[PDB]
Structure formats: C-alpha cells, structure tokens
C-alpha cells in the first residue's frame, strides 16, 4: 500500500508518556470532526481522557466522529458550534472547565482561501483569538494549536493566517496558561488530498493530474503526526513552537507512478502550479532548533509580539481593503504569490 | 441496488420547464456542498444557469462540489461563508445580484439538535432570517427554502426549527419577493443517513442497528426530489408551501433485510436499539386530502397563513435569550409536541 510505503514509522512514539499527559483530563478538541481533530479525539480516548468535548461547526463531521466513538459515548459531548460564537463558547468552557484544549479548527485549502481571504482571516485568526482568549479567561491549563509547514515563509493567505495564529497564541502564553504550537506537513490520505484523488482518477480510468513535474511534499500518517503532537504538548512548558521531523521529501510524480504500478494504462497530465502554491514546502527543522528527548520533535525559536499591537492589527484585518498588504505588515516574511 | 428499488421514478419530471426557470439566471445556493445543495448546484448547471454562487461554511463540502463541477469552473463561484455573517452575506448579494436563492443550508440531525438546541435555533431559524432578509433587501426575485416532513406536527427541535423557518420565509413573501417552501422526506444515500450507516456496519462485520421494528420512512432519489423542488419553484407565485408525493412508505426493517440479502450476508443479526428522543415511528404523510393540485402529479400546495413578522421577529429574539427553548418553540408552533 502507498500509505504504508510513505508512513514515517517514527521510532520515538511513546504511548505511556501521552497516557501520563491525558489520563483523567477534561479535554476539549476544536474541529473535532476534521482530519486532524478526529484523530486527536480518537487518541484522547485511547490514552485515557476522562471527558472529551468535541466542538465542530460541520454537522456531518461532528456526527461522524461522535458515531465513530460510540463505544465511549458516555465520555464524550458533541458540541455543534462555531468557535466564532464567543458567548456560546464561553458557556461551554464555564460548564465543562477543560484542562487542555487541542485546537484543530481552521480553514486550510490554499485555493479556496485565496478566493475567500476575508473568511480565512475570520475563521483562522479571529476564531483562534476567540477560542484562545476564552480558554485563558476560563483557566484552561494548556492550549495546543495545530499549525502547518505552509506557515513557514508563507506564500499564501491560508499559510499566513496560520502564522498569525502562532504569533497570537504563543504571545498569550504565561505561567498559568501554557501554549504550544506544532508544525507538521501533509497527512496521508486526508479528505480531498492528492492520494484519494489519484485513486479515484485511476478507478475512473482518468488521467492523473500532476501540478508540476518537480513538486514535492513531506508526508506522515495521521496517527503518527497526532501522537507526536500530543507528546509535544506533554513536554511543553508554555511558549514553544514545535516542529516535527517529517523524514524524506516525496516527489508527487513518483507518488503518481507508484500508484499506477500498484494497480497493474493511464497518462499523467501536467496541469500547472496554482496561485500561492509552493514547489517545495519549507523544511521544518532548522539547524539551530533545540532538540527534545524525542528525535522526531524540535523546538523552533519564536519571539512574543506586543499583544496591544497585534490586537489592533487583528481589528484592522477584519475591515481593511487589502488583506494581503495588512498580513505582510504582521508577517514580514510573507511573500504572497 | 436498494437505491434503484426505492427510487420514486416520478412520471412528471420536466426538463424544459426547469430550463425555462433557470436559463441564464444568476443563482445562489446556500449549503451548496450539502447533500441537497450539491444536487441543486448540479441541476443549476444542467438546466442552464449563467452563474452559480455556491455558499457553504464547510470547507471540504465547498471544495468537493467546486471540484465536482470543475468543467464549469468559469460559471461557478465558491463562497466559503456562514450565512450567519450578515455583513459578508450582504456584500456577496450586492456583488453578484442573484435572481434566485435556493436555501439548502441547515442542521438536520435530530439527535445532535436535541443535544444542541440553541445551535439549531441559531443556524436554522436565525440563519434563515438573515439570508431571507438580505435576499429581500437586495431585491432577489425568488427565494426557495428546502424544508422537511419533520416540520409537520414536529416532535423534535430540528423539525420545529424548520417549521419556524417556513413561517418566517412565507410571511416575508410579497409581490416583489416570491418565496416558496418545499417539504419532502428522506433522500436515499444522504450524508450520515441510515443506508451508509448500514453499509459501514456490514463492511465491518457488525450487527445492523435498527431503532424499532415498525419504523417507516418515505424515500426519493436526490435528483428526483431536487428536480421536483425546482419545478415547484418555477411555478411558485410567492407564498406557496409545496409538498411532494413520496410514494409508498418503507419499513426500515425491510430495507435492512434487503441490504443484508443483497450482500449475501444474512449471517448478520439485526439488533433493536430503541426509538430516540424526538424520533417518530412514522413521519407524517405529506399530501393532505385538501391540498391543491398543480400540473405536476407529484407536487401539491398545502395551506399556510402568514403570521405577523413583528410578532415573529420578537419571538425569534426571545429564542436567542430564553431559558427553555422547547417551551419558547411551542409558543411559535402550537402543534409542536416535543418527545423526550
Ligand atoms: N490535513 C493535513 O494534511 C494537514 C497537515 C498539516 C497541518 N494541517 C492543519 O491542521 C488544521 C486542521 O486541518 P484538517 O486537515 O483537519 O482540516 P479539516 O477541514 O479536515 O478539519 C477541520 C475541522 O475544523 C472544523 N472547523 C472549521 N472551522 C470551525 C469553526 N469556526 N468552528 C468550529 N469548527 C470548525 C471543520 O468543520 C472540520 O471538521 C489546519 O490548520 C491545517 O493547516 C493539516
Ligand atoms: N437529506 C435528506 O434526506 C433531507 C430530506 C428532506 C429535507 N432535508 C432538509 O434539507 C436541508 C439540508 O439537508 P442535507 O441533507 O443537505 O444536509 P447536509 O448537512 O448534507 O447539507 C447542508 C449543507 O449546508 C451547509 N451549512 C449548514 N449551515 C450553514 C451555514 N450557517 N452557512 C453556510 N452553510 C451551511 C453545510 O456545511 C452543508 O454542506 C435540511 O434542512 C434538511 O432537513 C433533507
Ligand atoms: O490533482 C492533484 C492534487 C494535488 N497535487 C499535488 O500533490 C501535493 C499534495 O496536494 P494536497 O492538496 O494533497 O495538499 P496541499 O499541500 O495541497 O495542502 C501538492 O504538491 C499538489 O500540488 C497534484 O499534483 N495533483
Ligand atoms: O442506525 C440507524 C440509523 C437510522 N435508523 C432508522 O432509519 C431511518 C432513517 O434514519 P436517517 O438518519 O437515515 O434519517 P432521519 O429520518 O433520521 O432524518 C429512521 O427511521 C431511523 O430511526 C436505524 O434504524 N438505524
Ligand atoms: Na513509554
Ligand atoms: Na455522549
């Protein structure tokens, strides 16, 4: 199988550490029905969370994760809710008092975010602000945000918004409220990602659509990335930007060709780079990143920004005419393509 | 397959009528990536809409319908938006000036809406008010709302919210702004519906979970139900509550049996799990003996009286603040009998 062939198989998965971090906690997962969120949920159960609160605005996704976890229904609360609804969210936090928030709600599709930049701003930046602010006010002990390699030297709106989320959450970290962000790259087989698409095209006797002959991504299984996220959250003291070692880059052409050989004839058609799309995402581990006890996990450097400043910029982002230009002022390494 | 066996095969599908209604229109579909919405989008393309504006708050669903329709990318605009965001929504309508809105955005799962009644109120009732109000202020000519047989003498939160939506939209209808609501029953193969549930249970060698041995639902293929919706919309003059003829009801037990038979796997037992809160054994038959006929044998007009919007807007505000949503709904919808 292709997923097998591309799995990382990190040597440093540590079940008992994550169990030690999660046992008997009240954990809330935002975007609980998403690719990342659903797996966060499954692992929270696996590693012994006492109560899992599942927040998602997509009814099918909340339904699906709730139904998937039906054997543990007595430990789970499905909360059908947008994290933009401050008042309802504050109520959820007051009532359940979670000790840990795993924040996996966002918009992530680069093209749809180039087409809908204001919604990417609201959903990603303003949603993260509201959830993070409400977590801190309601004495949540620890807050872990999912980030992405597309947040590093971002060339798209999506990625730049997640970079602003890193800046915000990490700047809210203090002795009482420990925030960590974790960057990682592509997850194998997430819905509406390149692999099931190729599998479909192959099953429909269609040509495989390849963006560019040279395009490469880094890949991990979802269970691999999520367990490493949780190990990172376990060791965090607050303020860390973590980065996962994704292993070898994979050329998407080679991925196409392996999938063809795997089903024993169709042509691969080149369709062109898309706006804001990178030929090679940034390698996540810098040579000056600090090591942790886990070989797959490093801590990248980050400075706090002034929150009065950053809040004003976030206010302005909601009303401004040129979102791209506003984002550059906040994220100077943003080179918008 | 089961789908074929339970397909309505309505004798009165009219392609040329639908084309005449949609040809060269700017049409906006809310919940564009949903089960019903996505089929609405497809048929807008099929029947010659000039420009389809696809509104949905679920990024994957929006992505998927957009991709599904990539051969028509130049005629579609994917708008990643919640209809609760009035100011972004007003600007969408000011920009694209749709002539028709097909409103297929809602929350529909009865158990989730029992557990999240406030979200059901906000997403369904408040989302419908905002979209409808904005459509009317922006001189959209016609507004069609997707409703449900669960809105008829509702016993659940979800169904009751949809009833309120019917009241609001229909009461908004006037000589400039033509509203139609269309009620129909279950769509075969829908998102999170019983048939995929049974398929996944068989795939993992588990027993089939059947709520109750006597439970029945009415069914239709999604393309049938949606083309009939659009035919209703085409003949609407504003104010009509339409109802579809769903044919013969289906006992879910027979469906479960058939699916077991059809994958040869009668090794599997059928465990009875029990009727859920809010859940009906038998949904209401949609056509009343006094409903009016149309030229389509599968579509009738049910009676409705406008309510006063000053009253209805006041109750809608109360729903957002009240202690007891069930009790507040009952004031708006006298026939609401909440099952716990
Ligand atoms: N999928 C990947 O390969 C991948 C890899 C690395 C990083 N990430 C990052 O992880 C994050 C999550 O992405 P994903 O792949 O799980 O996407 P997803 O769309 O599958 O999941 C996101 C979930 O969040 C929910 N959601 C979105 N906005 C919400 C809101 N305002 N309120 C409540 N719920 C909301 C969605 O309904 C969905 O279920 C993104 O920031 C993405 O960049 C994803
Ligand atoms: N599926 C059925 O069998 C069936 C039958 C009759 C009537 N209906 C009715 O049709 C409506 C939709 O049903 P469905 O089966 O399509 O559900 P769905 O969940 O499959 O589709 C709804 C779509 O609307 C979107 N949405 C929800 N809230 C939104 C918001 N605030 N802004 C933007 N988009 C939003 C969702 O993301 C989704 O893509 C419901 O009112 C339901 O009762 C469904
Ligand atoms: O039809 C496709 C879809 C994707 N890709 C490439 O495969 C990689 C993974 O795409 P995906 O959408 O899976 O995730 P993204 O990195 O886009 O978040 C990227 O280099 C894409 O350009 C491709 O070549 N053909
Ligand atoms: O696991 C299930 C799910 C549903 N049903 C029954 O099958 C019918 C279809 O339910 P569905 O959720 O598909 O849609 P609903 O009628 O609930 O909107 C209903 O009478 C349910 O009680 C069932 O027996 N087992
Ligand atoms: Na261990
Ligand atoms: Na539960």
Beta pairing partners, A300 = A241
CA of B215 to the centre of ligand 4 (A): 9
Whether A237 sits among the annotated catalytic residues: the reply is no
Task: Give the gyration radius of chain B's Cα atoms.
Answer: 20
Question: For chain A, how big is the Rg over CA atoms in Å?
Answer: 20
Residue B239 dihedral angles phi and psi, to the nearest 5°: 105, -5
At A315, list the tokens.
Answer: 């206010």
DSSP for residue B299: E
**Residue B179: how many CA atoms within 13 Å on its side-chain side?**
26
B82 carries a ligand binding annotation: yes
CA of A290 to the centre of ligand 5 (A): 22
What are the residues whose beta carbons fall under 8 Å from the beta carbon of B324, sequence distance 6 or more?
none
Nearest CA in chain A to B35: A60
Q: How far is the CA of A30 from the centre of ligand 3 (A)?
A: 25
Distance from CA of A122 to the nearest CA of B (A): 10
CA distance A63 to B192: 7
The answer to whether the CB atoms of B88 and A119 lie below 8 A apart is: yes
Q: How far apart are CA A286 and CA A162, in angstroms?
A: 19
Kind and range of the H or E run holding B50: none
Other residues' Cβ atoms within 10 Å of the Cβ of residue B165: 25
Q: CB contacts < 8 Å between A and B, how many?
A: 77
Way it was determined:
X-ray
Task: Say if B161 is an interface residue toward chain A (CB within 8 Å).
Answer: no
Cα separation values, A328 from A167, A325, B340, Å: 13, 5, 54
Q: How many CA atoms lie within 13 A of A32 on its CB side?
A: 34
Joined tokens for residue B307:
């309510």
Task: Please report which residue ranges of chain B form alpha helices under DSSP H.
Answer: 2-6, 15-22, 35-46, 59-68, 86-96, 110-115, 117-120, 127-137, 157-172, 194-203, 222-235, 252-262, 309-321, 325-332
Of all protein residues, the one whose alpha carbon is nearest to atom 19 of ligand 1 is: A34
Report CA torsion sign: B119, B120, B123, B126. negative
Q: Which two tokens stand for residue B30?
A: 């809310």
CATH superfamily to which B2-252+279-332 belongs: NAD(P)-binding Rossmann-like Domain (3.40.50.720)
User: To 10 degrees, what angle do helices B309-321 and B157-172 make?
Assistant: 150
Token representation of residue A23: 């046992």
CB atoms within 10 A of CB B320: 14
Is A113 strand, coil or helix? helix
Query: Strand locations in A1-63, DSSP E?
Result: 26-30, 51-56
Buried b (16+ CB within 10 A) or exposed e, B170-207: bbbbeeebbbbbbbbbbbbbbbbbbbeebeebbeeeee
Measured at the alpha carbon of residue A19, what is the angle toward residues A15 and A22, in degrees to the nearest 5? 140
Smallest Cα–Cα separation from B331: which of B320, B126, B318? B318
**Residue range A2-330 in CATH 3.30.450.20:** no
| Apex B187 CA angle, B181 and B189, nearest 5 | 150
Q: Are B326 and B164 a contacting pair, CB within 8 Å?
A: no
Please give the Cα distance from A313 to A308 (Å, whole number): 9
Sheet containing strand B142-146, edge to edge, reads: B76-80, B51-56, B26-30, B100-103, B142-146, B178-183, B240-244, B299-302, B292-293
Q: Would you say A186 is a known binding-site residue?
A: yes
Ligand 3 atom closest to Cα of A193?
Answer: 13
Cα gap B330→B317, rounded to integer Å:
15
- Asked if B32 and B65 count as a contact pair (C-beta separation under 8 A), the reply is yes
Q: Is B78 on the interface with A (CB under 8 A)?
A: yes
Q: How far is the C-alpha of A92 from the C-alpha of B197, rounded, in Å?
A: 29
| Residue A194, ligand 3, Cβ within 6 A | yes
Give every CB contact of residue B309 below 8 A, 6+ residues apart in sequence: B168, B171, B172
Resolution of this model in Å is 2.0
Instruction: Identify which of B60, B78, B84 has the shortest CB distance to residue A191.
Output: B60
Structure tokens at B279: 């859940």
Beta bridge partners of B209: B271
């Amino acid at each position: 199988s292709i997923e097998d062939l591309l799995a990382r198989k990190p040597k440093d998965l540590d079940d008992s550490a994550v169990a030690a971090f999660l046992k008997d906690k009240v954990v809330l997962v935002s975007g609980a029905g998403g690719t990342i969120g659903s797996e966060l949920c499954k692992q929270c159960i696996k590693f012994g969370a006492k109560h899992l609160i599942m927040v998602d605005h997509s009814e099918y996704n909340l339904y699906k994760i709730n139904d998937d976890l039906n054997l543990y229904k007595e430990k789970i609360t499905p909360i059908l809710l947008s994290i933009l609804d401050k008042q309802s969210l504050d109520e959820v936090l007051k009532t359940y008092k979670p000790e840990l928030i795993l924040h996996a709600a966002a918009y992530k599709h680069v093209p749809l975010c180039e087409q809908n930049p204001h919604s990417a701003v609201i959903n990603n930046i303003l949603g993260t602000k509201i959830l993070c602010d409400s977590a801190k006010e309601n004495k949540v002990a620890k807050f872990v945000m999912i980030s992405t390699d597309k947040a590093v030297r971002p060339t798209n709106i999506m990625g730049c918004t997640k970079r602003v989320c890193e800046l915000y959450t990490l700047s809210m970290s203090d002795e009482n409220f420990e925030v960590a962000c974790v960057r990682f790259g592509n997850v194998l087989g997430s819905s509406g990602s390149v692999i099931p698409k190729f599998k479909a095209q192959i099953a429909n006797n269609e040509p495989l659509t390849l963006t560019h002959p040279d395009i490469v991504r880094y890949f991990m299984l979802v269970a691999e990335a999520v367990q490493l996220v949780l190990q990172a959250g376990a060791i965090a003291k607050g303020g860390e930007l973590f980065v996962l070692d994704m292993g070898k880059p994979v050329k998407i052409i080679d991925l196409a060709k392996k999938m063809l050989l795997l089903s024993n004839d169709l042509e691969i058609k080149i369709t062109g780079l898309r706006k804001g799309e990178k030929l090679y995402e940034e390698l996540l581990i810098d040579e000056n990143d600090a090591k942790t006890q886990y070989e797959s996990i490093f801590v990248a450097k980050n400075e706090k920004v002034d929150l009065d400043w950053l809040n004003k910029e976030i206010e302005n982002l909601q009303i401004c005419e040129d979102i791209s230009e506003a984002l550059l002022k906040i994220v100077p390494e943003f080179k918008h393509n």
